[PDB]
Every structure is written in C-alpha cells, then in structure tokens.
Amino acid sequence: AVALPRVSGGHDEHGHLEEFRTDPIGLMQRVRDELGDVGTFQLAGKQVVLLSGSHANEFFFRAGDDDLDQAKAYPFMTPIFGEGVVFDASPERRKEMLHNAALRGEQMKGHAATIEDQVRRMIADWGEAGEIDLLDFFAELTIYTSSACLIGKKFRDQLDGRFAKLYHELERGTDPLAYVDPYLPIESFRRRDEARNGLVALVADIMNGRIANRDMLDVLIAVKAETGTPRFSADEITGMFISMMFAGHHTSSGTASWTLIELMRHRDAYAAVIDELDELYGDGRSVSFHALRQIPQLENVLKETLRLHPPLIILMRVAKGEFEVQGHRIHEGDLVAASPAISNRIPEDFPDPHDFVPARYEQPRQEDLLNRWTWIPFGAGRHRCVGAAFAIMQIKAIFSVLLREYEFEMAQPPESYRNDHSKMVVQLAQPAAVRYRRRT
C-alpha cells in the first residue's frame, strides 16, 4: 500500500514514457541521482522499479524466473517471434534451440573463419580509399555474419542488401509503447509488420528457387506432414530464422561500430592495437586461430567500449512475488529493471567513469572482474549472456581483418557519433561517416 519513491517529471500522457523514448539514459540517471539504489518511473500503465548499485543489482541478477521472470519482460519481441512454431517445446527450451547448437565451443573455429570470409567479401570493392557509413556497413556485415554462422553459408549466399534493410525496419519496431501493447496502431509498428512480411517473402522466394534445383533450410523444406504436404510454411521458417539472428545482430552491429569509433577517437589505443595485430599475425596463423585466443589490447578496447556503450541499456523482469530491497517493497506484477548504461558508469566502481581507459581491464586492475554486479554489458548471474564468447570472438575476427587491411579516420566531428535510443533496440544514429585508406 506504501508507494515506492518516484522520479521527478513524468507529467506527459504516458507518464515517463515520452522521456524514456527521447532520453532514457538521462531519465534512468535521474532516478539514481534523486532516489538512490531503488527508485521508480512510470511507463504508461506500468511502474518500473529501477535498481542500481552492487547490492540491488546482485538481487536482480541472482533471481531466477520463479522470483523475477525474464520470459514476459520484453514484449516488443512478441510480434517478432510471431505465431509460427517450428520445433514445439516449452518456452525455455525453444529459447535454448535458437542459439545453443551454433554457440558450441567446437563450432567457434569454423565461425571465426566464416566471419573472416564475410568481412573480406564486404570490403572486396573498397579499393584504395573511400568513405563508408558505419551503420550501413556494420548492419549489413552483421546480417551476413549472423546468417552464415547461425543458419548456414548456403543460406547467407542467397541474401543481399534487401534482407538487411528489412531486418533494420524490424528492429525499429521496438518502441517502448510495446510495454502498453506491441500491436498498437503506430507507424513504426506498422512498418515492423510490413518488414516482417517482406522477410517472409524473401525466404519464400529462396524456398521456391531451391525446389527447382543440405543446410538447415533444406532440412526444414524436406519435412513432410502425414499426407505428404510440406510440414512448414515460409512464415514458420522465417519466424525461426529471424528469431535465431536477433540477439546477435543489433549487438554485433553496434559493438563493432563503437569499437571502431573509440579506436578513432583514441589514436594511442588504435596504434597499440595495430602493433599488437601485426605482431600476433606475424606467426602466420589464421584468424580462425587468433580470434579464439588472447588479443589483449583489442580485447581491452572492446571491454571499455562495452562499458561506455552497452548495446542493451536496460534489462527487465516481472516480479512473481513480493520482495524487499533496502527496505523498499517490490510487489507481484511490478516491472523490475537494471541498467547497464547507468551501472557501468557508477563513479565509485569505475574511476573517471566517462573516460575511455582500456587499461582498466589489464591484469593488475581487472575492473570488469572486480565489479561483478555493476560491470554488466553482458548482464550477470542467472541470465548472463550465453553469446558473449561468440560476440567477443566475432569482434576479434572482424577487426583482425579490417585493421590489417585498412586505416580509418573520422569524416565528421568526433563528438557527432551517437546512438538513437528511442527504441528498445539501440541503433547507431546517422550520419556516421568514416574515411578509409589501404594500409601501406
């Protein structure tokens, strides 16, 4: 019956939702600044209990779904999974099935080689010098890396830029209004639905083309119902493929962009990384060898990039019961959140938190490992990212190629590179123009 502390503002139609669209990080920081480790904001009808700091975060992260349910806490995903089911099982098991085969350790070497090949294909027409836009380049690249590694090379070879453009529109269909209802009649939700239909059509075209001529798609095409009719539709297959690719796409795209941006903004780190790559690859071993092993300067740059630019800025649960955190009572049904954007910059935990300091992660310091509940770009505890090893290998593979072949410079002011945080799926804003030139 007692209400939790509530952050200032929130006087718009849907409470704090309008501000959560326009400046979610400022809102979440204001919750912490005004209220401390436990505070709330209103997302339309829903109260969000935002936790921060090590103690409250530990509660959040160590909770299992019996206490804090993650399954229903990201409703923007519902229209993405859609209605089709290919492999019928419990929600939890269907989730395992999306990723686990491809994430097996024994598959990593092959993925690193695949990723290398995709990067070389993407830069094949670059020539001596030119300009790219980071969102256009990395969003497309990571469609190819994600499809080739998760679904198969044969399938990726039938994809082109159209798939990437449509997938982007799908990701843009994640407005926080989805906590109201992900099927509301707003333009971005409409464009999401149209884009999903376009992706189904691309897959149908691929399926039809193959009939007239044994990757995962071949297997699924061949499955017959009792009468001989094919068991699976293009919609069912497409829904599964879209869902298999989703977690790794926006995160790899953004993380690659921000890793390159931070390298360009910090040319001392960039120089150190180049030297390290040149020396390491001087043993003559392939990217499929090195991307699975230590590349310390690059890895520390990546860790610091993830600290400053975590691709998921808020993590969500639905409380399944009542809990007390620092004397504040969370009630059944409450949305409960933790924020990597805020936690990753707590000044007690990360000295000079707004500064890019890859040395934070060197062996004597290890600020990532020390701050178990507040260095959280991959989450922590029960639901810690199962894709982290893959994601880190992929950055190492991508930059092993890019940084040895080309030199990069910012074509716009360094301060002008920024994210669009208006959707639950964060994307780099445009323009993000960058010059390249072949290394001599």
Ligand X SMILES: Cc1ccc(S(=O)(=O)NCCCOC(=O)Nc2ccncc2)cc1
CA 139 to chain centre: 11
Residue type, 403: L
| DSSP label of 327 | T
Which of the listed partners (ligand X, ligand HEM, none) does 138 bind, with a CB threshold of 5 to 8 Å by partner kind? none
Cβ closest to ligand HEM, residue 231 vs residue 418: 418
How far is Cα 113 from Cα 405, in angstroms, rounded to an integer?
Answer: 16
Which of the listed partners (ligand X, ligand HEM, none) does 377 bind, with a CB threshold of 5 to 8 Å by partner kind? ligand HEM
Q: Which of 167, 161, 164, 155 is nearest to 209 (CA)?
A: 155
**Residue 412, marked binder:** no
Which of the listed partners (ligand X, ligand HEM, none) does 425 bind, with a CB threshold of 5 to 8 Å by partner kind? ligand X
Task: Rule CB under 6 A: say whether 189 interacts with ligand X.
Answer: no
**Residue 165, marked binder:** no
Footprint on residues 367-406 left by ligand X (CB under 6 A): 385, 387
**Residue 406, marked binder:** no
Cβ closest to ligand X, residue 43 vs residue 280: 43
Task: Rule CB under 6 A: say whether 240 interacts with ligand X.
Answer: no
Q: Is the dihedral of CA 293, 297, 303, 306 positive or negative?
A: negative
**Residue 383, marked binder:** yes
Question: Measured from the CB of residue 218, what is the shortest distance to ligand X in angstroms?
Answer: 23
Q: Give the E-state strand segments of 249-334 in sequence order.
A: 315-319, 323-325, 328-330
Task: Rule CB under 6 A: say whether 210 interacts with ligand X.
Answer: no
DSSP character string of 121-179: HHTTT--SEEEEEHHHHHHHHHHHHHHHHHT-HHHHTT--HHHHHHHHHHHTT--GGGG
Residue type, 439: R
Q: Is the dihedral of CA 234, 236, 237, 239 positive or negative?
A: positive
Residues that bind ligand HEM (CB under 6 A): 70, 99, 103, 247-248, 251-252, 255, 311-312, 315, 377-379, 383, 385-387, 390-391
Comparing every residue's Cβ against ligand X, the nearest one is 247
Question: Measured from the CB of residue 279, what is the shortest distance to ligand HEM in angstroms?
Answer: 26
List 46's β-bridge partners, or say none: 43
Footprint on residues 96-115 left by ligand X (CB under 6 A): 98
Which of 220, 277, 425, 426 touches ligand X (CB under 6 A)? Answer: 425
Which of the listed partners (ligand HEM, ligand X, none) does 390 bind, with a CB threshold of 5 to 8 Å by partner kind? ligand HEM
**Residue 70, marked binder:** yes
Residue type, 414: P
How far is Cα 197 from Cα 422, in angstroms, rounded to an integer?
Answer: 23
How far is Cα 73 from Cα 97, in angstroms, rounded to an integer?
Answer: 20
Question: Measured from the CB of residue 273, what is the shortest distance to ligand X in angstroms?
Answer: 25
Task: Rule CB under 6 A: say whether 77 interacts with ligand X.
Answer: yes
Task: Rule CB under 6 A: say whether 434 interacts with ligand X.
Answer: no
**Residue 421, marked binder:** no
Task: Rule CB under 6 A: say whether 74 interacts with ligand X.
Answer: yes
By CB under 6 A, which span of 240-248, 338-346, 396-404, 408-416 interacts with ligand X? 240-248
Task: Rule CB under 6 A: say whether 70 interacts with ligand X.
Answer: yes
Cβ closest to ligand X, residue 26 vs residue 387: 387
Residue at token pair 């198969």: 152
By CB under 6 A, which span of 210-218, 223-231, 243-251, 367-375 interacts with ligand X? 243-251
DSSP character string of 360-411: GGSTTT-HHHH-TTT--TT--GGG--TTHHHHHHHHHHHHHHHHHHEEEEES
Structure tokens at 367: 């600020």
How far is Cα 179 from Cα 349, in angstroms, rounded to an integer?
Answer: 32
Instruction: Kindly give the residue spans of alpha helices, DSSP state H, lying in 10-90.
Output: 17-22, 24-35, 54-62, 78-81
Cβ closest to ligand HEM, residue 210 vs residue 383: 383
Question: Measured from the CB of residue 317, what is the shortest distance to ligand HEM in angstroms?
Answer: 7
Q: Given the rule CB under 6 A, which residues bind ligand X? A: 70, 74, 77, 95, 98, 243, 246-247, 251, 312, 385, 387, 425
Q: Detail the residues annotated as belonging to a binding site for heme b.
A: 70, 74, 95, 317, 383, 385
